Design a protein around this ligand. Structure first.
Ligand code: CL
Ligand code: ZN
Ligand code: ZN
Length: 152
């Protein structure tokens, strides 16, 4: 079961839902993401970045794609695949998303190369537009608009 609660904040620092994570059996991690205040009906880029720091207003700070296998971006890229690349989120008429997805190339185990919960942590970020699953570095998914820091 599902732990490591992370609070999601938007560019204006408002709380806009949460993520929790299960070490799956298996494999990789299952990510339960339940967010609100997003653009009704949009497909939005959604990735794991290499530092657990969510500082307004652009979240540059930080980092990273989470990319321990040094690949380039995108499911569709013949030279793809960052480990922190996740499917687009599909926002309801609601403006909400509430789904569980699998992130097969990640782990929470200390000493795994795919461990996202290192000393520096990681960040889950939702982008303003759809990831095209091909362009580097981030699929042309535009601005980072929601961020949740995973620390520990
Ligand atoms: Cl990315
Ligand atoms: Zn990527
Ligand atoms: Zn849920």
């Amino acid at each position: 079961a599902f732990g490591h609660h992370v609070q999601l904040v938007n560019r204006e620092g408002k709380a806009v839902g949460f993520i929790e994570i299960k070490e799956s059996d298996d494999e990789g991690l299952d990510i339960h993401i339940s967010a609100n205040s997003l653009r009704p009906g949009a497909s939005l880029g959604f990735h794991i970045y290499e530092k657990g720091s969510c500082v307004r207003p652009d979240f540059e700070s930080a980092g990273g794609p989470f990319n321990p296998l040094n690949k380039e971006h995108g499911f569709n890229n013949p030279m793809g695949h960052h480990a922190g690349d996740l499917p687009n989120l599909e926002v309801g008429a609601d403006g909400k998303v509430d789904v569980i997805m699998n992130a097969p190339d990640t782990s929470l185990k200390k000493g795994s190369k795919l461990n996202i919960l290192d000393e520096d942590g990681s960040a889950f970020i939702i982008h303003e537009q759809a990831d095209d699953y091909l362009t580097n570095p981030s699929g042309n998914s535009g601005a980072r608009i929601v961020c949740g820091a995973l620390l520990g």
